[PDB]
């Protein structure tokens, strides 16, 4: 009948604790029982690989839907806890009254073992750990005002968490959807693009227009939080709103009529940052979401469902083919509607890419009240979202490779774009290799050249703004374009989207919130290094996807799998030739890439933006503008950045920042610890274990689960894990400790 219908099987899986007591039930091999320690590790590594646990897409699909509900439940509990801790263990009320002086804190340590030192004198007759997630600013923007409200949102969160968990159980054990239900992309997109995003934005705009905007205006004006009317009061008494925004008097009459102009009071396109709080005007944010909402809702009506009108994605994809691309995009629809791994690849890459964009756009255009001046929170958020993004992007590549090895079928892909790509893979990889070498030699060479020149007493031969100069002309041009846009290419706007492009210095509390950021030779040099790092990462990852099934060296790599240790010592050596290993190596380069980016942000900002400005025009940046002539050499980074900005962590003992010092050291230890897994091999360890077991046997006792050394692949994984934790952890402490002081 209808193309789109709901098909669900009742009572699919019985709920019992029997399987719980039978570890390894999901796998046929593991189910037999443990005979060596490898079984234990394999149990945990194959837990969520449903494709290998079952051969039916319906079953795999059912598990994924329910598992997702589980994650949602966890996320809800997390958010709930944060709000609760902000209601019972925080100084929000005090901060709300004096946001500039009091420091945000929402965690308190018990008075055990001198750990109390960690409870700092943040302010407002309160002692606790200074948090840096930015909760206080967000709550202020929403218009919380009280701590009772925080408690209630916490309760809502707990309730929501439970509902999600029930949903997971219900849709797996009692009402499990069939495969036909899952395979309805057009419907899903229509619903998710119009309901989840469109209605979501519209609903949020409602809160912002009726509750947040009015309260925040009063707060900024000076009204004491206790004197601001309760949220419900604004919703009921239109007169009160009319006082603040003199258009609510007209009511919704202007809206139904075409006179949307009358609502210019609260819907505006001002641009720039609020002078008092140093954040984007909420009026603009309200119009933003309202506009986006309309767009999303309209977009949700593009695909056919059950009424004839609409587009069928298959047709659109197949029609787009050209002279240089054979059958074009034929075959892609089936792939994306019959392979979860393929979908995850695209979705995961885009999600990670978004996080990176959020990081850039959220510092240049501060979105929350009193966020820019809080340097600690700004740095924390930028770095956090930069990392999340990197991991996700690499993950997308990984799952893309899993697709090629597990779901790719030659029959369904003849002369399509995918086939043609795999037919000239040598050309693609060869060229990218060259691009990477070119960029790397030229970009890093600049730094080495400068180091040598400065050391040889020849400063006039360096690539600097005072010698041979490499100016970023293109970027400088775009900046000017964006600066002059308000009033020209953007006539109805009133100010620059960001003061970074150009403008005046916005200061809040004697501290600089935003200032024009200029680009010179040093910036050129660093930006091109970023390009090199990203390009190399792509090379490793793309090579893995393209050569996943076969290679000149190992023609039958596909049969070996996605995660095999090697093929042997032959052919000169075939170690680490799997696609999994390419992901393994890619993560190391992603670490390098992101590390450089976050360091660039930290030094540039502390040198050319952040700081204090006097009543008159005197700007004193935190580091003093050293970036221009010091970041052009490697010695400069080691001395004027790492060595100098690390004075805080190393001298944190005896203070509330002591934890960071300990973690800094601990992270270094873990990083080094990992190098033993990354440089050694299973053979040595297995033999050592044999001798150790001899001792236990000599005393008449030994485990039946014979002790064995970690697999080759696991060894690499353990090493990478500790390596990443240690490296990121070290910077984490370094940044946070430094930031607390600079703030």
């Amino acid at each position: 009948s209808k193309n789109v219908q709901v098909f669900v099987e009742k009572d699919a899986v019985e709920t019992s604790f029997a399987k719980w007591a039978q570890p390894g039930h999901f796998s046929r091999t593991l189910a037999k029982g443990p005979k060596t320690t490898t079984w234990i590790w394999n149990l945990h590594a194959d837990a969520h690989d449903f494709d290998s646990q079952t051969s039916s897409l319906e079953e795999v699909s059912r598990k994924i839907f329910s598992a997702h509900f589980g994650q949602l439940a966890i996320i809800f509990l997390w958010i709930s806890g944060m709000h609760f801790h902000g209601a019972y263990f925080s100084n929000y009320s005090a901060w709300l009254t004096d946001p500039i002086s009091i420091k945000q804190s929402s965690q308190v340590v018990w008075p055990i073992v001198g750990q109390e030192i960690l409870n700092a004198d943040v302010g407002g007759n309160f002692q606790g750990i200074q948090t840096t997630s930015g909760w206080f600013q967000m709550w202020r923007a929403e218009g919380i005002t009280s701590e009772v409200e925080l408690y209630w949102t916490a309760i809502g969160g707990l309730a929501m968490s439970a509902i999600m968990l029930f949903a997971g159980w219900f849709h797996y054990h009692k009402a499990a959807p069939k495969l036909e239900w899952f395979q309805n992309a057009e419907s899903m997109m229509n619903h998710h693009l119009a309901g989840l995003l469109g209605l979501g934005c519209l609903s949020w705009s409602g809160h912002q227009i009726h509750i947040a905007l009015p309260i925040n205006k009063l707060l900024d004006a000076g009204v004491s939080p206790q004197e601001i009317p309760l949220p419900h009061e604004f919703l009921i008494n239109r007169d009160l709103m009319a006082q603040l925004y003199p258009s609510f008097s007209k009511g919704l009459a202007p809206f139904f009529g075409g006179n949307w102009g009358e609502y210019s009071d609260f819907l505006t396109f001002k641009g720039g940052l609020n002078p008092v709080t140093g954040g984007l005007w909420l009026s603009d944010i309200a119009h933003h979401h309202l506009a986006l909402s309309v767009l999303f809702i309209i977009a949700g009506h593009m695909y056919r469902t059950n009424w004839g009108i609409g587009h069928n994605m298959k047709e659109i994809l197949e029609a787009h083919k050209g002279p240089f691309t054979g059958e074009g995009h034929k075959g892609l629809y089936e792939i994306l509607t019959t392979s979860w791994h393929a979908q995850l690849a695209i979705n995961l890459a885009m999600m990670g890419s978004l996080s990176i964009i959020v990081a850039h756009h959220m510092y240049a255009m501060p979105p929350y009240p009193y966020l820019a001046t809080d340097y600690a929170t700004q740095l924390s958020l930028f770095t956090h979202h930069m990392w999340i993004g990197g991991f996700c992007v690499v993950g997308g590549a990984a799952h893309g490779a899993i697709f090629m090895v597990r779901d790719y079928t030659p029959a369904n892909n003849y002369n399509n774009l995918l086939d043609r790509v795999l037919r000239h893979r040598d050309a693609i990889i060869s060229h990218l290799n060259w691009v990477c070498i070119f960029l790397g030699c030229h970009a890093f060479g600049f730094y080495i050249h400068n180091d040598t020149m400065r050391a040889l007493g020849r400063p006039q031969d360096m690539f600097s703004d005072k010698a041979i100069q490499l100016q970023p002309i293109f970027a400088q041009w775009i900046q000017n374009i964006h600066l002059l846009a308000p009033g020209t290419t953007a006539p109805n706007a009133l100010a620059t989207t960001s003061y970074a492009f150009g403008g005046d210095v916005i200061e809040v509390g004697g501290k600089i919130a935003m200032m024009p950021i200029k680009l010179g030779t040093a910036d050129f040099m660093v930006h091109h290094i970023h390009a090199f790092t990203i390009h190399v990462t792509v090379l490793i990852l793309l090579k893995g996807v393209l050569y996943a099934r076969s290679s000149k060296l190992i023609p039958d790599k596909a049969n070996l799998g996605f995660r095999f240790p090697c093929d042997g010592p032959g052919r000169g050596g075939t170690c680490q030739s799997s696609s999994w290993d390419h992901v393994f190596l890619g993560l190391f380069w992603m670490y390098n890439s992101i590390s450089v980016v976050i360091f660039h942000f930290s030094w540039k900002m502390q040198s050319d933006v952040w700081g204090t400005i006097t009543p008159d025009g005197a700007i004193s940046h935190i580091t003093g503008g050293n970036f221009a002539q010091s970041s052009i050499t490697i010695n400069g980074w080691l001395r004027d950045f790492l060595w100098s900005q690390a004075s805080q962590v190393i001298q944190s003992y005896g203070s509330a920042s002591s934890a960071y010092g300990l973690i800094f050291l601990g992270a270094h230890f873990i990083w080094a610890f990992s190098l033993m897994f990354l440089f050694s091999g299973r053979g040595y360890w297995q033999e050592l274990i044999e001798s150790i077991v001899w001792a236990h046997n000599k005393l008449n006792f030994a485990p039946t689960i014979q002790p064995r050394a970690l697999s080759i692949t696991q060894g690499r994984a353990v090493g990478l894990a500790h390596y990443l934790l240690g490296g990121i952890g070290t910077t984490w402490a370094f940044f946070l400790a430094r930031a607390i002081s600079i703030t």
């Binding site: 000149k552 039958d556 052919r571």
Partner: protein, 80 residues
């Protein structure tokens, strides 16, 4: 190039000859085992040194041993 040797502990499981990626091993008639067959390495000039054969042997210690040695284009798996 490489040297592959078979020992008397073979049981004629044929698993090794079914794993070689370059047809270096064969099953020849023999009387020392119940199966009445033993493995041989007639074409070691095509051994790449993968050691897949060894991984397939079921005997306590490999009855088929591959000792890596002189390297040629064939043994180094060079298509170029």
């Amino acid at each position: 190039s490489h040297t592959v040797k078979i020992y008397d502990t073979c049981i004629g499981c044929t698993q090794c000859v079914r794993a070689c990626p370059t047809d270096v091993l064969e099953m020849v008639p023999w009387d020392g085992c119940k199966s009445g067959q033993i493995a041989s390495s007639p074409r070691v000039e095509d051994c790449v040194g993968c050691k897949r054969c060894e991984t397939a042997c079921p005997t306590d210690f490999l009855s088929v041993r591959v000792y890596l040695g002189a390297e040629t284009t064939r043994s180094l798996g060079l298509a170029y």
